[PDB]
PDB file of C-alpha atoms and ligand atoms in Angstrom:
ATOM      1  CA  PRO A   1     -29.009 -73.405 -53.494  1.00  0.00           C
ATOM      2  CA  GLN A   2     -26.789 -70.832 -56.241  1.00  0.00           C
ATOM      3  CA  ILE A   3     -23.293 -71.167 -55.630  1.00  0.00           C
ATOM      4  CA  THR A   4     -20.701 -68.890 -56.989  1.00  0.00           C
ATOM      5  CA  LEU A   5     -17.526 -69.777 -58.670  1.00  0.00           C
ATOM      6  CA  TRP A   6     -15.157 -67.450 -56.580  1.00  0.00           C
ATOM      7  CA  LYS A   7     -13.920 -70.348 -54.749  1.00  0.00           C
ATOM      8  CA  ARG A   8     -14.488 -74.420 -55.517  1.00  0.00           C
ATOM      9  CA  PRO A   9     -17.514 -75.505 -55.223  1.00  0.00           C
ATOM     10  CA  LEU A  10     -17.046 -77.820 -52.467  1.00  0.00           C
ATOM     11  CA  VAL A  11     -20.004 -79.586 -50.596  1.00  0.00           C
ATOM     12  CA  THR A  12     -20.528 -82.040 -47.889  1.00  0.00           C
ATOM     13  CA  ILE A  13     -21.780 -85.822 -49.049  1.00  0.00           C
ATOM     14  CA  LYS A  14     -22.401 -88.834 -46.922  1.00  0.00           C
ATOM     15  CA  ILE A  15     -21.754 -92.212 -48.560  1.00  0.00           C
ATOM     16  CA  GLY A  16     -21.048 -95.559 -47.285  1.00  0.00           C
ATOM     17  CA  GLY A  17     -21.725 -93.905 -43.708  1.00  0.00           C
ATOM     18  CA  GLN A  18     -19.189 -91.717 -44.082  1.00  0.00           C
ATOM     19  CA  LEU A  19     -18.926 -87.833 -44.491  1.00  0.00           C
ATOM     20  CA  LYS A  20     -16.762 -86.445 -47.013  1.00  0.00           C
ATOM     21  CA  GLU A  21     -16.234 -83.333 -48.730  1.00  0.00           C
ATOM     22  CA  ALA A  22     -16.491 -83.468 -52.724  1.00  0.00           C
ATOM     23  CA  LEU A  23     -16.421 -80.967 -55.249  1.00  0.00           C
ATOM     24  CA  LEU A  24     -19.310 -80.429 -57.707  1.00  0.00           C
ATOM     25  CA  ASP A  25     -17.783 -80.927 -61.110  1.00  0.00           C
ATOM     26  CA  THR A  26     -19.949 -80.247 -64.082  1.00  0.00           C
ATOM     27  CA  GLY A  27     -16.470 -81.022 -66.521  1.00  0.00           C
ATOM     28  CA  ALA A  28     -16.434 -84.960 -64.924  1.00  0.00           C
ATOM     29  CA  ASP A  29     -18.827 -87.693 -66.669  1.00  0.00           C
ATOM     30  CA  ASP A  30     -18.165 -89.978 -63.660  1.00  0.00           C
ATOM     31  CA  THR A  31     -18.339 -89.387 -59.746  1.00  0.00           C
ATOM     32  CA  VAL A  32     -14.892 -90.185 -58.590  1.00  0.00           C
ATOM     33  CA  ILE A  33     -14.218 -91.257 -54.718  1.00  0.00           C
ATOM     34  CA  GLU A  34     -11.037 -91.403 -52.902  1.00  0.00           C
ATOM     35  CA  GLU A  35     -10.471 -94.768 -51.584  1.00  0.00           C
ATOM     36  CA  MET A  36     -13.130 -97.028 -49.579  1.00  0.00           C
ATOM     37  CA  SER A  37     -14.777 -99.756 -49.164  1.00  0.00           C
ATOM     38  CA  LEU A  38     -18.410 -99.577 -50.696  1.00  0.00           C
ATOM     39  CA  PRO A  39     -20.959-102.649 -50.806  1.00  0.00           C
ATOM     40  CA  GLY A  40     -21.168-105.140 -53.445  1.00  0.00           C
ATOM     41  CA  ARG A  41     -19.763-106.360 -56.652  1.00  0.00           C
ATOM     42  CA  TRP A  42     -17.219-103.826 -58.384  1.00  0.00           C
ATOM     43  CA  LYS A  43     -15.316-104.150 -61.572  1.00  0.00           C
ATOM     44  CA  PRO A  44     -12.650-102.289 -62.866  1.00  0.00           C
ATOM     45  CA  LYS A  45     -12.447 -99.151 -64.742  1.00  0.00           C
ATOM     46  CA  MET A  46     -10.001 -96.735 -66.368  1.00  0.00           C
ATOM     47  CA  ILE A  47     -10.907 -93.166 -66.039  1.00  0.00           C
ATOM     48  CA  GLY A  48      -8.802 -89.969 -67.629  1.00  0.00           C
ATOM     49  CA  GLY A  49      -8.404 -86.672 -67.284  1.00  0.00           C
ATOM     50  CA  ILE A  50      -5.571 -84.111 -67.323  1.00  0.00           C
ATOM     51  CA  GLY A  51      -2.599 -86.155 -67.105  1.00  0.00           C
ATOM     52  CA  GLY A  52      -3.657 -89.040 -68.036  1.00  0.00           C
ATOM     53  CA  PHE A  53      -5.766 -92.742 -66.685  1.00  0.00           C
ATOM     54  CA  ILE A  54      -5.794 -93.799 -63.588  1.00  0.00           C
ATOM     55  CA  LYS A  55      -7.545 -97.154 -62.259  1.00  0.00           C
ATOM     56  CA  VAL A  56     -10.996 -97.453 -60.619  1.00  0.00           C
ATOM     57  CA  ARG A  57     -13.036 -99.969 -59.246  1.00  0.00           C
ATOM     58  CA  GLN A  58     -16.718 -98.925 -60.529  1.00  0.00           C
ATOM     59  CA  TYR A  59     -19.643 -99.863 -58.134  1.00  0.00           C
ATOM     60  CA  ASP A  60     -23.252 -99.601 -59.311  1.00  0.00           C
ATOM     61  CA  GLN A  61     -26.372 -98.301 -57.343  1.00  0.00           C
ATOM     62  CA  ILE A  62     -24.847 -96.790 -54.809  1.00  0.00           C
ATOM     63  CA  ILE A  63     -26.578 -93.980 -52.934  1.00  0.00           C
ATOM     64  CA  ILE A  64     -24.723 -90.696 -52.110  1.00  0.00           C
ATOM     65  CA  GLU A  65     -26.291 -87.742 -49.847  1.00  0.00           C
ATOM     66  CA  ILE A  66     -25.231 -84.216 -51.552  1.00  0.00           C
ATOM     67  CA  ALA A  67     -25.483 -81.437 -49.601  1.00  0.00           C
ATOM     68  CA  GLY A  68     -29.103 -82.875 -48.186  1.00  0.00           C
ATOM     69  CA  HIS A  69     -30.171 -84.224 -51.442  1.00  0.00           C
ATOM     70  CA  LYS A  70     -30.042 -88.082 -51.955  1.00  0.00           C
ATOM     71  CA  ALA A  71     -28.737 -89.250 -55.280  1.00  0.00           C
ATOM     72  CA  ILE A  72     -28.412 -93.231 -56.906  1.00  0.00           C
ATOM     73  CA  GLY A  73     -25.960 -94.196 -59.508  1.00  0.00           C
ATOM     74  CA  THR A  74     -22.577 -95.570 -59.960  1.00  0.00           C
ATOM     75  CA  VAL A  75     -19.629 -94.617 -58.203  1.00  0.00           C
ATOM     76  CA  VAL A  76     -15.609 -95.079 -59.157  1.00  0.00           C
ATOM     77  CA  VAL A  77     -13.273 -95.652 -56.225  1.00  0.00           C
ATOM     78  CA  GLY A  78      -9.861 -94.787 -56.356  1.00  0.00           C
ATOM     79  CA  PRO A  79      -6.265 -92.819 -55.994  1.00  0.00           C
ATOM     80  CA  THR A  80      -7.913 -89.046 -56.485  1.00  0.00           C
ATOM     81  CA  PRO A  81      -6.409 -86.327 -54.884  1.00  0.00           C
ATOM     82  CA  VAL A  82     -10.142 -84.622 -54.267  1.00  0.00           C
ATOM     83  CA  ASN A  83     -13.766 -86.216 -54.409  1.00  0.00           C
ATOM     84  CA  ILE A  84     -15.783 -85.458 -57.319  1.00  0.00           C
ATOM     85  CA  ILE A  85     -19.436 -85.401 -57.863  1.00  0.00           C
ATOM     86  CA  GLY A  86     -19.774 -85.899 -61.944  1.00  0.00           C
ATOM     87  CA  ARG A  87     -22.555 -85.400 -64.054  1.00  0.00           C
ATOM     88  CA  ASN A  88     -24.252 -88.947 -63.291  1.00  0.00           C
ATOM     89  CA  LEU A  89     -25.354 -87.417 -59.747  1.00  0.00           C
ATOM     90  CA  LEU A  90     -25.415 -83.714 -60.825  1.00  0.00           C
ATOM     91  CA  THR A  91     -28.373 -84.722 -63.097  1.00  0.00           C
ATOM     92  CA  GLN A  92     -30.318 -86.230 -60.019  1.00  0.00           C
ATOM     93  CA  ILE A  93     -29.997 -83.397 -57.916  1.00  0.00           C
ATOM     94  CA  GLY A  94     -31.589 -81.051 -60.644  1.00  0.00           C
ATOM     95  CA  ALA A  95     -28.251 -78.961 -60.736  1.00  0.00           C
ATOM     96  CA  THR A  96     -27.753 -76.603 -63.591  1.00  0.00           C
ATOM     97  CA  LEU A  97     -25.511 -74.299 -65.198  1.00  0.00           C
ATOM     98  CA  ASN A  98     -26.952 -70.810 -65.456  1.00  0.00           C
ATOM     99  CA  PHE A  99     -25.348 -67.691 -67.139  1.00  0.00           C
TER     100      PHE A  99
ATOM    101  CA  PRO B   1     -29.152 -69.754 -70.553  1.00  0.00           C
ATOM    102  CA  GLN B   2     -30.117 -72.502 -68.317  1.00  0.00           C
ATOM    103  CA  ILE B   3     -27.560 -75.791 -68.686  1.00  0.00           C
ATOM    104  CA  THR B   4     -28.688 -79.049 -67.560  1.00  0.00           C
ATOM    105  CA  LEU B   5     -25.911 -81.587 -67.182  1.00  0.00           C
ATOM    106  CA  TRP B   6     -27.230 -84.721 -68.916  1.00  0.00           C
ATOM    107  CA  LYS B   7     -25.065 -84.340 -71.732  1.00  0.00           C
ATOM    108  CA  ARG B   8     -21.523 -82.896 -71.245  1.00  0.00           C
ATOM    109  CA  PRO B   9     -22.677 -78.695 -71.182  1.00  0.00           C
ATOM    110  CA  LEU B  10     -20.143 -77.822 -74.238  1.00  0.00           C
ATOM    111  CA  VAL B  11     -20.253 -74.473 -75.818  1.00  0.00           C
ATOM    112  CA  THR B  12     -18.261 -72.533 -78.672  1.00  0.00           C
ATOM    113  CA  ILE B  13     -15.771 -70.281 -77.961  1.00  0.00           C
ATOM    114  CA  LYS B  14     -13.869 -67.603 -79.789  1.00  0.00           C
ATOM    115  CA  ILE B  15     -10.555 -67.441 -79.431  1.00  0.00           C
ATOM    116  CA  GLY B  16      -7.826 -65.752 -81.851  1.00  0.00           C
ATOM    117  CA  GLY B  17     -10.468 -65.606 -84.546  1.00  0.00           C
ATOM    118  CA  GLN B  18     -10.955 -68.999 -84.468  1.00  0.00           C
ATOM    119  CA  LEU B  19     -14.034 -71.255 -82.883  1.00  0.00           C
ATOM    120  CA  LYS B  20     -13.471 -73.840 -80.991  1.00  0.00           C
ATOM    121  CA  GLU B  21     -15.978 -76.375 -78.275  1.00  0.00           C
ATOM    122  CA  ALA B  22     -15.141 -76.275 -75.021  1.00  0.00           C
ATOM    123  CA  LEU B  23     -16.330 -77.881 -71.846  1.00  0.00           C
ATOM    124  CA  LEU B  24     -18.045 -75.516 -68.982  1.00  0.00           C
ATOM    125  CA  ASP B  25     -16.268 -76.512 -65.923  1.00  0.00           C
ATOM    126  CA  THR B  26     -17.018 -75.818 -62.182  1.00  0.00           C
ATOM    127  CA  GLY B  27     -14.454 -78.675 -61.407  1.00  0.00           C
ATOM    128  CA  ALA B  28     -11.453 -76.929 -63.183  1.00  0.00           C
ATOM    129  CA  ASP B  29      -9.727 -73.768 -61.447  1.00  0.00           C
ATOM    130  CA  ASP B  30      -8.221 -72.666 -64.738  1.00  0.00           C
ATOM    131  CA  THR B  31      -9.069 -72.363 -68.320  1.00  0.00           C
ATOM    132  CA  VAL B  32      -7.034 -74.961 -70.532  1.00  0.00           C
ATOM    133  CA  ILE B  33      -6.400 -74.415 -74.174  1.00  0.00           C
ATOM    134  CA  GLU B  34      -5.662 -77.200 -76.501  1.00  0.00           C
ATOM    135  CA  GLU B  35      -2.342 -75.977 -78.415  1.00  0.00           C
ATOM    136  CA  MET B  36      -2.571 -72.830 -80.525  1.00  0.00           C
ATOM    137  CA  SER B  37      -0.666 -69.764 -81.065  1.00  0.00           C
ATOM    138  CA  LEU B  38      -1.527 -66.600 -79.032  1.00  0.00           C
ATOM    139  CA  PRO B  39       0.686 -63.433 -78.854  1.00  0.00           C
ATOM    140  CA  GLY B  40       2.915 -62.162 -75.498  1.00  0.00           C
ATOM    141  CA  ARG B  41       4.648 -63.725 -73.388  1.00  0.00           C
ATOM    142  CA  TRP B  42       3.958 -66.912 -71.592  1.00  0.00           C
ATOM    143  CA  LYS B  43       5.041 -68.097 -68.295  1.00  0.00           C
ATOM    144  CA  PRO B  44       5.336 -71.490 -66.771  1.00  0.00           C
ATOM    145  CA  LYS B  45       2.722 -73.610 -64.828  1.00  0.00           C
ATOM    146  CA  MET B  46       1.878 -76.752 -64.340  1.00  0.00           C
ATOM    147  CA  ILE B  47      -1.624 -77.943 -63.294  1.00  0.00           C
ATOM    148  CA  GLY B  48      -2.530 -80.976 -61.738  1.00  0.00           C
ATOM    149  CA  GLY B  49      -5.864 -83.674 -62.685  1.00  0.00           C
ATOM    150  CA  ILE B  50      -6.680 -86.549 -62.141  1.00  0.00           C
ATOM    151  CA  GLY B  51      -3.740 -88.663 -64.235  1.00  0.00           C
ATOM    152  CA  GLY B  52      -1.523 -86.492 -62.919  1.00  0.00           C
ATOM    153  CA  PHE B  53       0.512 -83.239 -63.707  1.00  0.00           C
ATOM    154  CA  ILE B  54       1.284 -81.301 -67.474  1.00  0.00           C
ATOM    155  CA  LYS B  55       3.385 -78.507 -68.107  1.00  0.00           C
ATOM    156  CA  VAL B  56       0.923 -75.412 -69.603  1.00  0.00           C
ATOM    157  CA  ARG B  57       2.349 -72.183 -70.894  1.00  0.00           C
ATOM    158  CA  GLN B  58       0.311 -69.632 -69.397  1.00  0.00           C
ATOM    159  CA  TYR B  59      -0.664 -66.366 -70.982  1.00  0.00           C
ATOM    160  CA  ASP B  60      -2.746 -63.392 -69.603  1.00  0.00           C
ATOM    161  CA  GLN B  61      -5.283 -61.488 -70.753  1.00  0.00           C
ATOM    162  CA  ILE B  62      -6.725 -63.234 -73.052  1.00  0.00           C
ATOM    163  CA  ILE B  63      -9.412 -62.057 -75.037  1.00  0.00           C
ATOM    164  CA  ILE B  64     -12.269 -65.184 -75.879  1.00  0.00           C
ATOM    165  CA  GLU B  65     -16.011 -65.234 -76.365  1.00  0.00           C
ATOM    166  CA  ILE B  66     -17.579 -68.012 -74.732  1.00  0.00           C
ATOM    167  CA  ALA B  67     -21.268 -68.491 -75.871  1.00  0.00           C
ATOM    168  CA  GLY B  68     -21.566 -65.235 -76.954  1.00  0.00           C
ATOM    169  CA  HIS B  69     -20.301 -63.644 -74.122  1.00  0.00           C
ATOM    170  CA  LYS B  70     -16.653 -61.802 -73.719  1.00  0.00           C
ATOM    171  CA  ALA B  71     -13.976 -62.643 -70.909  1.00  0.00           C
ATOM    172  CA  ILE B  72     -10.190 -61.233 -70.838  1.00  0.00           C
ATOM    173  CA  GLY B  73      -8.014 -63.256 -68.384  1.00  0.00           C
ATOM    174  CA  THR B  74      -5.647 -66.171 -67.969  1.00  0.00           C
ATOM    175  CA  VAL B  75      -5.416 -69.136 -70.475  1.00  0.00           C
ATOM    176  CA  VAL B  76      -2.743 -71.802 -70.521  1.00  0.00           C
ATOM    177  CA  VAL B  77      -2.072 -73.956 -73.649  1.00  0.00           C
ATOM    178  CA  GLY B  78      -1.060 -77.240 -73.374  1.00  0.00           C
ATOM    179  CA  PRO B  79      -1.478 -80.800 -74.056  1.00  0.00           C
ATOM    180  CA  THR B  80      -5.852 -81.361 -72.713  1.00  0.00           C
ATOM    181  CA  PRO B  81      -7.927 -83.593 -74.235  1.00  0.00           C
ATOM    182  CA  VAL B  82     -10.583 -81.305 -74.150  1.00  0.00           C
ATOM    183  CA  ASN B  83     -10.717 -77.243 -74.188  1.00  0.00           C
ATOM    184  CA  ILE B  84     -11.699 -76.398 -70.415  1.00  0.00           C
ATOM    185  CA  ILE B  85     -13.547 -73.219 -69.637  1.00  0.00           C
ATOM    186  CA  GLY B  86     -12.504 -72.955 -65.663  1.00  0.00           C
ATOM    187  CA  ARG B  87     -13.932 -70.701 -62.835  1.00  0.00           C
ATOM    188  CA  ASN B  88     -11.326 -68.316 -63.767  1.00  0.00           C
ATOM    189  CA  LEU B  89     -13.224 -67.462 -66.939  1.00  0.00           C
ATOM    190  CA  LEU B  90     -17.123 -68.791 -65.588  1.00  0.00           C
ATOM    191  CA  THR B  91     -16.884 -66.168 -63.076  1.00  0.00           C
ATOM    192  CA  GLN B  92     -16.299 -63.315 -65.506  1.00  0.00           C
ATOM    193  CA  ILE B  93     -19.542 -64.354 -67.450  1.00  0.00           C
ATOM    194  CA  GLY B  94     -21.418 -64.632 -64.485  1.00  0.00           C
ATOM    195  CA  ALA B  95     -21.986 -68.507 -64.346  1.00  0.00           C
ATOM    196  CA  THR B  96     -23.300 -69.964 -61.572  1.00  0.00           C
ATOM    197  CA  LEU B  97     -24.119 -73.655 -60.265  1.00  0.00           C
ATOM    198  CA  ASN B  98     -28.179 -74.425 -59.152  1.00  0.00           C
ATOM    199  CA  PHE B  99     -30.049 -77.023 -57.601  1.00  0.00           C
TER     200      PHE B  99
HETATM  201  C1  ROC C   1      -8.097 -78.935 -65.829  1.00  0.00           C
HETATM  202  C2  ROC C   1      -7.661 -78.664 -64.707  1.00  0.00           C
HETATM  203  C3  ROC C   1      -7.184 -77.113 -64.372  1.00  0.00           C
HETATM  204  C4  ROC C   1      -6.572 -79.660 -65.014  1.00  0.00           C
HETATM  205  N1  ROC C   1      -8.420 -79.125 -63.725  1.00  0.00           N
HETATM  206  C5  ROC C   1      -8.588 -80.674 -63.368  1.00  0.00           C
HETATM  207  O1  ROC C   1      -8.360 -81.417 -64.074  1.00  0.00           O
HETATM  208  C6  ROC C   1      -9.005 -81.015 -62.225  1.00  0.00           C
HETATM  209  C7  ROC C   1      -8.225 -81.683 -60.920  1.00  0.00           C
HETATM  210  C8  ROC C   1      -9.470 -82.124 -59.962  1.00  0.00           C
HETATM  211  C9  ROC C   1      -8.198 -82.923 -58.797  1.00  0.00           C
HETATM  212  C10 ROC C   1      -7.929 -84.236 -59.333  1.00  0.00           C
HETATM  213  C11 ROC C   1      -9.201 -84.840 -59.511  1.00  0.00           C
HETATM  214  C12 ROC C   1     -10.313 -83.842 -60.631  1.00  0.00           C
HETATM  215  C13 ROC C   1     -10.202 -83.032 -60.357  1.00  0.00           C
HETATM  216  C14 ROC C   1     -11.337 -81.711 -60.974  1.00  0.00           C
HETATM  217  N2  ROC C   1     -11.002 -81.557 -62.170  1.00  0.00           N
HETATM  218  C15 ROC C   1     -11.450 -80.842 -62.950  1.00  0.00           C
HETATM  219  C16 ROC C   1     -12.636 -81.947 -64.026  1.00  0.00           C
HETATM  220  O2  ROC C   1     -13.352 -81.164 -64.337  1.00  0.00           O
HETATM  221  C17 ROC C   1     -11.853 -82.913 -65.113  1.00  0.00           C
HETATM  222  C18 ROC C   1     -11.990 -81.672 -66.104  1.00  0.00           C
HETATM  223  C19 ROC C   1     -11.380 -82.435 -67.367  1.00  0.00           C
HETATM  224  C20 ROC C   1     -12.598 -83.100 -68.469  1.00  0.00           C
HETATM  225  C21 ROC C   1     -11.665 -83.681 -69.275  1.00  0.00           C
HETATM  226  C22 ROC C   1     -11.001 -83.641 -69.722  1.00  0.00           C
HETATM  227  C23 ROC C   1      -9.751 -83.770 -68.850  1.00  0.00           C
HETATM  228  C24 ROC C   1     -10.033 -82.417 -67.726  1.00  0.00           C
HETATM  229  N3  ROC C   1     -12.695 -83.775 -65.611  1.00  0.00           N
HETATM  230  C25 ROC C   1     -12.058 -85.130 -65.287  1.00  0.00           C
HETATM  231  O3  ROC C   1     -11.054 -85.216 -65.062  1.00  0.00           O
HETATM  232  C26 ROC C   1     -12.846 -85.911 -65.330  1.00  0.00           C
HETATM  233  C27 ROC C   1     -13.128 -87.297 -64.631  1.00  0.00           C
HETATM  234  C28 ROC C   1     -14.056 -88.599 -64.981  1.00  0.00           C
HETATM  235  N4  ROC C   1     -13.603 -89.237 -65.758  1.00  0.00           N
HETATM  236  O4  ROC C   1     -15.058 -88.171 -64.978  1.00  0.00           O
HETATM  237  N5  ROC C   1     -12.658 -86.524 -67.185  1.00  0.00           N
HETATM  238  C29 ROC C   1     -13.754 -86.276 -67.986  1.00  0.00           C
HETATM  239  O5  ROC C   1     -14.821 -86.733 -67.714  1.00  0.00           O
HETATM  240  C30 ROC C   1     -13.362 -86.570 -69.316  1.00  0.00           C
HETATM  241  C31 ROC C   1     -14.406 -86.579 -70.364  1.00  0.00           C
HETATM  242  C32 ROC C   1     -13.469 -86.504 -71.714  1.00  0.00           C
HETATM  243  C33 ROC C   1     -12.108 -86.762 -71.687  1.00  0.00           C
HETATM  244  C34 ROC C   1     -11.909 -87.061 -72.844  1.00  0.00           C
HETATM  245  C35 ROC C   1     -10.680 -87.258 -73.430  1.00  0.00           C
HETATM  246  C36 ROC C   1      -9.586 -87.597 -72.579  1.00  0.00           C
HETATM  247  C37 ROC C   1     -10.104 -87.679 -70.746  1.00  0.00           C
HETATM  248  C38 ROC C   1     -11.764 -87.228 -70.472  1.00  0.00           C
HETATM  249  N6  ROC C   1     -12.225 -87.118 -69.390  1.00  0.00           N
HETATM  250 CL1   CL C   2     -24.935 -93.943 -63.007  1.00  0.00          CL
END
């Protein structure tokens, strides 16, 4: 698909057996999901953005289906107001910015 | 151009006659620039991100070149860690996300 940016580039994802809405975010290093349980081990991390940092739990080798495209990678979980698909998974579905 | 996302999508911008580095950010509603002087009056705005909110100065109808493409629109100035080109100006340069 080609997505114009007049509005927020929101898509449906599947993660942990759950459907969620998420933002396709070229300005994010990481994939940050609102609080949910995920399988396997995790470790704590601090991630920063405008405003400062938040504490998250980092889970590795997590599969997410992103608007129909499967990708695997590290997902961090914590108190974000918006689920964001960052570059670590955007690369895996072949996403590019074009102008 | 076609910009992949293995690295941060950083480009050169020109604002106020000055060259700066900025991030092309589909996740950002607004364009946020590091402290600098800009002409005219400003109005207040609060912008929210991952760690919370920051106060910025909103300047309308600012001329800015982005990777060689001219945009004229709203920029907010404040204590951002990274200059961010958000959707308000990405649309003016005709940017799309594709996968
Ligand atoms: C810029 C503004 C207009 C305020 N918009 C936003 O911040 C919205 C807010 C939304 C609600 C909260 C959840 C995030 C979404 C998406 N974001 C956009 C989104 O693209 C945002 C833009 C950004 C990039 C760089 C630095 C700061 C801010 N990115 C991020 O928040 C990601 C989160 C992450 N760690 O992966 N940060 C970074 O990728 C990142 C990179 C370099 C940095 C250097 C110093 C300090 C912080 C740094 N953060
Ligand atoms: Cl990863």
